[PDB]
Amino acid sequence: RCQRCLLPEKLCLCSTITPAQAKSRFCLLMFDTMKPSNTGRLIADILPDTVAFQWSRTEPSQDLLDLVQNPYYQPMVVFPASYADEQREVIFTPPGKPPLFIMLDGTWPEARKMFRKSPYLDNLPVISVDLSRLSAYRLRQYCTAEVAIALLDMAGDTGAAAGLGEHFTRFKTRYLAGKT
């Protein structure tokens, strides 16, 4: 197995990676800090400015707090609108200020716990994802990578959205064939 791409050495895709540029930026809030089937790591392959943090219940990192409170960005929590309280601001599109998409990586019981017990995210708006936009990139819950492609298209980053789609498709195919 390759160590960079985690695919068996006969199926390495590291030679095919070509990054794209986007006005949007991603922040990965990880619960365990990686398994080969985790799709959030594919985002950094196409957008190397992606930042990642290990989630902590008691003591959040000072690097993380300085980012979500940086007025340069318009931060927003990416989580389905059904899970939000009646007073929580919910939006359906990313507004001038470049978005900072905060993803909650992990299984659904863990992403719910991260959503419910992080006081530093409670004043941020929630963005509900229009997954219908995956049709324009010929893609069919939905993993962290598929949601990211929809967000890039929602913000006008078509070049980066198309790139992540071909890279994600390239990975899924070599992953299935590696099981054979």
Q: Could you list the residues that contact ligand MTA (CB under 6 A)?
A: 78-80, 103-106, 108, 111, 128-129, 141-144, 147
The whole-angstrom separation of Cα 139 and Cα 145 is 12
The whole-angstrom separation of Cα 143 and Cα 9 is 24
Could you tell me which of 139, 158, 117, 152 has the C-alpha nearest to residue 26? 152
Which stretch in 8-16, 45-53, 63-71, 124-132 sits in contact with Zn ion by CB under 5 A? Answer: 8-16
From the list 6, 11, 20, 131, which residue makes contact with its own copies (rule: CB under 8 A)? 11
Whether the CB-CB separation of 125 and 89 falls below 8 Å is answered with: yes
Quote the least distance from Cβ 177 to its own copies, whole Å: 4
Which stretch in 14-22, 30-38, 76-84, 85-93 sits in contact with Zn ion by CB under 5 A? Answer: 14-22
Phi/psi at 36 (5° precision): -65, -30
Q: Quick one: what does residue 14 bind among its own copies, ligand MTA, Zn ion, none, with the CB cut-off 5 to 8 Å set by partner type?
A: Zn ion
Phi/psi at 60 (5° precision): -70, 150
Quote the least distance from Cβ 46 to Zn ion, whole Å: 15
Residues that bind Zn ion (CB under 5 A): 2, 4-5, 12, 14
